[PDB]
Amino acid sequence: KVVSTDEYVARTNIYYHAGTSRLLAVGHPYFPIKKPNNNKILVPKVSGLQYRVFRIHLPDPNKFGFPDTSFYNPDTQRLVWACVGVEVGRGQPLGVGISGHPLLNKLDDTENASAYAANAGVDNRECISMDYKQTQLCLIGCKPPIGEHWGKGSPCTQVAVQPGDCPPLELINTVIQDGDMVDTGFGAMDFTTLQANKSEVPLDICTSICKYPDYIKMVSEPYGDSLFFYLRREQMFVRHLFNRAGTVGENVPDDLYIKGSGSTANLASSNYFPTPSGSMVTSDAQIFNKPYWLQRAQGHNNGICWGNQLFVTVVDTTRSTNMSLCAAISTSETTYKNTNFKEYLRHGEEYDLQFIFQLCKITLTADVMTYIHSMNSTILEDWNFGLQPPPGGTLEDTYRFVTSQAIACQKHTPPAPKEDPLKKYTFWEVNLKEKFSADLDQFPLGRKFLLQLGL
């Protein structure tokens, strides 16, 4: 049986503020720019559709050096960080991006035709673009977010798939890493594996995988560490309607129509697909640059930044506008020479975070400990319990204690630093160990929060 942190976690009257200076990232809106032969990314892919994930690092409360230390007993409890306030800073001016593909598998406008379509030659793909679905979102937890999507699931030992044969599906959960792709209006799937075509969607996503927060699962979480707070805002509609060029994978059951004749005689592709379009963006629509008070949470964990860790995951298309910059090759010719100018595409993102944390103590008794351990070993392991004098213990014991304790200050500092249990994954690192403060008055959030609560 699980229980709200409030049960074992004690709340102090201590509050602290912390926030990034001003985060900035600039790169290519569709793909990274690396050396042709090499691989070192001279320029990284940077689009408003990249899942912004932050591994916010906090200073160990217990290890932290406080003014007064009376408020709690280190011989009976440990300190933990609890977030209570957060504000996401979005600095770029509102605007929209736009993506596409020079050879998207477009066949023809199925929206409205005067006469029947032509015949499928070869390489009928074209160069198109669009405005993906408008999406705003953010979430936080002491654990990283988990996305769901579609992929080629392992099959069964039967008909050894005939090349071209349609692949099997499977919903797949995955840790939403920083930079990953958010649904654009085409669904969540491994386009790479599912679309051998390599021209069914704009490049920026062509070879990637669009992920979606498996909200459900995340909440189903008992402890609910994954995320305790969040909010989503997506919307989109049909810009255009098109036919997918290629060859029929599955044929249309004749029992659903009358045979053609002449031009009509031969069936046209029925495999249509739409053009997504995130409608206009607005201020009132905005979801960031606003404070969030995580006072209560429907989850068992109530903002208990365990391991002094944190996970802010954001997504905001609202400022996707990428600027087309061009440089000339020669400051001569008084005539426009297409060949005299090199065209480039760049996009930038402005971010800034800020939070409020409440200090918390936790009396550690058996059951307590256990529960925690059972909940998540590490937590304790990570902590350190300096040997202490056994109460009323036999002189012998006490003695030994001393000895050991004494020989514990041999100045020997060989503490092998642990290893990031998620080294595998990678996201935006955010060290805050040196950004904590008390006089929140010196900060907006502080003021706000402060005044807000009042006391």
Residues 320-349, interacting with a second copy (CB under 8 A): 321-330, 334-339, 341-346, 348
| Number of Cα atoms under 13 Å in the Cβ half of residue 380 | 16
Rounded least distance, CB 46 to a second copy, Å:
10
CB atoms within 10 A of CB 178: 17
Of these, 63, 71, 73, 249, which contacts a second copy (CB under 8 A)?
A: 249
Distance CA 227, CA 143 (A): 7
Breaks in the chain (C to N over 2.5 Å), named by the residue before each, are none
Q: Which is nearer to a second copy, 205 or 372 (CB)?
A: 205
- Dist. CA 333–CA 416, nearest whole Å: 65
Q: Is 411 left (phi over 0), alpha (psi -120 to 50) or beta?
A: left
Q: Copy the structure tokens of residue 383.
A: 């902590």
- Report how far Cα 329 is from the mean position of its chain's Cα atoms: 40
For a second copy, what does the binding mask look like between residues 350 and 389, x meaning CB under 8 A? Answer: x-x-------------------------------------
Q: Which residue, chain included where needed, has tokens 């690092």?
A: 57
By CB under 8 A, is residue 67 in contact with a second copy? no
Give the pair of three-digit tokens for residue 340: 């005299």
Burial 329-345 (b: 16+ CB within 10 A, else e): eeeeeeeeeeeeeeeee
Segment contacting a second copy by CB under 8 A, of 51-59, 234-242, 390-398, 405-413: 234-242
Smallest gap from residue 33 Cβ to a second copy (A) = 5
Q: Please name the residues in contact with 164: beta carbons below 8 A apart, sequence gap of 6 or more.
A: 249
User: Which residues between 195 and 214 bind a second copy (CB under 8 A)?
Assistant: 195-200, 203, 206-207, 212, 214
**Of 298-317, which residues contact a second copy (CB under 8 A)?**
298-300
Q: Does 100 bind a second copy (CB under 8 A)?
A: yes
Name the β-bridge partners of 292. Answer: 86
User: Closer to a second copy at the Cβ: 83 or 96?
Assistant: 96
Interface of this chain with a second copy, residues 7 to 46, rule: CB under 8 A: 22, 24, 26, 28, 30-31, 33, 43
User: Which of 95, 174, 398, 422 touches a second copy by CB under 8 A?
Assistant: 95
Tokens (6 digits) for 112? 């409205």
Could you say which of 65, 67, 121, 415 contacts a second copy (CB under 8 A)? 121
- Interaction of residue 219 with a second copy, rule CB under 8 A: yes
Nearer to a second copy, 77 or 110 (CB): 110
Q: Which is nearer to a second copy, 247 or 394 (CB)?
A: 247
The binding track of 177-196 with respect to a second copy, each residue x by CB under 8 A or -, is: ------x-xxxxx----xxx
Q: Indicate the residue among 31 and 401 with the shorter CB distance to a second copy.
A: 31
Under the binding rule (CB under 8 A), the answer on residue 122 touching a second copy is yes
Closest CB to a second copy among 114 and 413? 114
Among 41, 66, 109, 420, interactor with a second copy by CB under 8 A: 109
User: Is the Cβ–Cβ distance between 418 and 381 less than 8 Å?
Assistant: no
Closest contact distance (angstroms) between CB of 268 and a second copy is: 4
- Please name the residue that has the structure tokens 């379509």: 117
Tell me the C-alpha distance between 229 and 238, whole Å: 31
- Could you tell me which stretch among 9-17, 374-382, 394-402, 445-453 binds a second copy (CB under 8 A)? 445-453
The token pair at 322 is 């990428």
List the one residue out of 214, 217, 377, 375 whose CA is nearest residue 301. 375
For a second copy, the closer of residues 70 and 112 by Cβ is 112
Q: Give the interface segment with a second copy, choosing from 49-57, 294-302, 370-378, 395-403 (CB under 8 A).
A: 294-302
Please count the residues of this chain forming the interface with a second copy, following the rule CB under 8 A: 169
Residue 270 is a binding residue for a second copy (CB under 8 A): yes
How many angstroms separate the CA atoms of 82 and 8, rounded?
13
Minimum distance of a second copy from residue 214's CB (angstroms): 7
Non-local (6+) Cβ contacts of 142 within 8 A are: 225, 301, 304, 305, 306, 307, 309, 310, 311
Contact 98, 130 (CB under 8 A): yes
Single out the residue of 57, 64, 89, 358 in contact with a second copy (rule: CB under 8 A).
89
Site for a second copy in 382-421 (CB under 8 A): none
